[PDB]
Structure formats: structure tokens, C-alpha cells
Design a binder for this molecule. Sequence first.
Ligand SMILES: CC1(C)CNc2cc(NC(=O)c3cccnc3NCc3ccncc3)ccc21
Length: 286
Amino acid sequence: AERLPYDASKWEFPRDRLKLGKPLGRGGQVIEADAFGIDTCRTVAVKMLKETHSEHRALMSELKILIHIGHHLNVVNLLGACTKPGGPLMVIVEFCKFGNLSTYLRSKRNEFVPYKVAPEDLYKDFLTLEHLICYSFQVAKGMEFLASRKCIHRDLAARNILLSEKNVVKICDFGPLKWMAPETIFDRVYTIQSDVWSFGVLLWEIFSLGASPYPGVKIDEEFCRRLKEGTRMRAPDYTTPEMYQTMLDCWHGEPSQRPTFSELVEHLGNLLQANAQQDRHHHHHH
Ligand SMILES: CC1(C)CNc2cc(NC(=O)c3cccnc3NCc3ccncc3)ccc21
């Protein structure tokens, strides 16, 4: 990463081939944009610094980390960068027009059935348990990929998951105590296992169809103490019993007792296969 030089021949993109559009977030800022000849004209998301040496290294590190990590279907894809003199540092990635998963699920609350049967058009475009388990499975394969390369996300949450074309989700980072593991809060310790705690919170978000975690709770000292003491969220409204138990496994007090992402990939894959088998029967009988 920060040790591996930046290969300009491969990634460098001309600033004048970029037409900056509207903001997607502001914190540096992330804006939508049209890129000509990046891969003729295509939509992309750009992260650029304001017109600070520290903030500069941060964006440059994100860039180097992205090149290093490489490609995976469930991780937003890097397309290029503007790093040479003449203008601001810019990191360009594929644009996901559908936005973050939380806001998307929140918009489908009146379009959900656990599964479909004929006539299926009654549920055209509805979300189902298959979709929810599939989103979870994809994020897990995405994190397994990152974990295999020793990468730690730090802010894994629904707002950082993006929806793509055919129900494909991608892990991103626009760059939140409610998603933080106890040891992260009390010890400022970040590890792959603290990302597992977060995944657990993401699962809750998914099976509550975009609700904000810990509903009706002030995030004060008591919240933190209870978390440390073993208090957990109750099951969301659209969860199956297995999925809620998986959340609980991710919220184990001892980081070493939580499952790994490889185990979650395998486990979620099975819950998906079971759900599918159940569905074929439901469909065949009704
Ligand atoms: C998790 C990790 C591998 C480490 N850091 C990081 C950063 C990103 N970067 C972005 O997600 C990003 C970069 C530049 C511009 N926008 C970004 N994300 C916001 C976005 C992405 C796609 N569509 C709309 C908004 C992606 C993945 C990772």
C-alpha cells in the first residue's frame, strides 16, 4: 500500500476528461461526475480534497489501499485517479446510482413478502427473505475478501453498502458508536473481529429493512455500560430465527468467540440455500 508506489501508467486519468456533478456527501467531498474514456462516457463517483498535507496523505492512502486490495464483485471498483500536478488529488470509482442500502430498504417497507408464489406479478419488484439473505451473503463475501488481505473497514454499516444493478451490493466507504464493538469503544482497539460486531449491526439493519439501530435509546454512558454488561438489541421485524442468532454470535463479548467472515460466508450461504429450497416447494404447491 503506502509502501507500494502508485503506478500512474495504469491508473492516472486526465482532469479535463472529468465533468463534476452534484455532491453525494460532504465531509473533502464526494461528488457524482461524468468521465470520458475512463474505461465512451460513464458515470463515476469522485473523492477530492478541498483547495492540508495530512488530509492529502489520507486520500492518497485510500487510493494506494484500493489498488493493493484489488478487485472483487462486492467491493466498489476503483477506476482511476488524478494525482499529478495541475489540480486537486482525486480518487475515482464506479458510481452506484441506487445509493446506500439503508435508504433503499427503508423505501421498500410496503413492498415485502417473505417469498413469492404464482401469480408472481402480485409482488413485482418486492423484497423477499431471499433478497435480504442475499445482501447479507454478498457483504460477507466482500468482508471475507478484505479480511483475507488484512484490511479492517472500521465503519461497516448499511450507509456504507451500495446497491448495484441486479441486486448486487458493494462495500464502500464515504469516509457512530451504535456500530462500534465494546473493545473499540472502551479500548480504541480495531480488528477484523470488531468489524464482525459491526456486520452483526448491519444484519440487524438489513432485517429491520433500514431501521436505525437501538431504537428509542439515548447513546449516553448508560448505553455503553449496558453494551459492556451484555445487553443486546432485540430481533428486528423481518428476521428469521437463524439470522437473529447469527447477529447474537457477532455480538459476543469476547472478540475471539465471534465467527470469522469465512464462517459467516459459509453459514449465510447455507441459510440462503435452505431458503431457496423452501421457496421452490412453496412455489410448487401454490
Ligand atoms: C473499505 C475500503 C476497501 C477501504 N477504504 C475504502 C474506500 C472506498 N472508497 C469509496 O467508497 C469512494 C471513493 C471515491 C469516491 N466515492 C467513494 N464512495 C462513495 C460512492 C461510491 C459509489 N457511488 C456513490 C458513492 C471504497 C472501499 C474502501
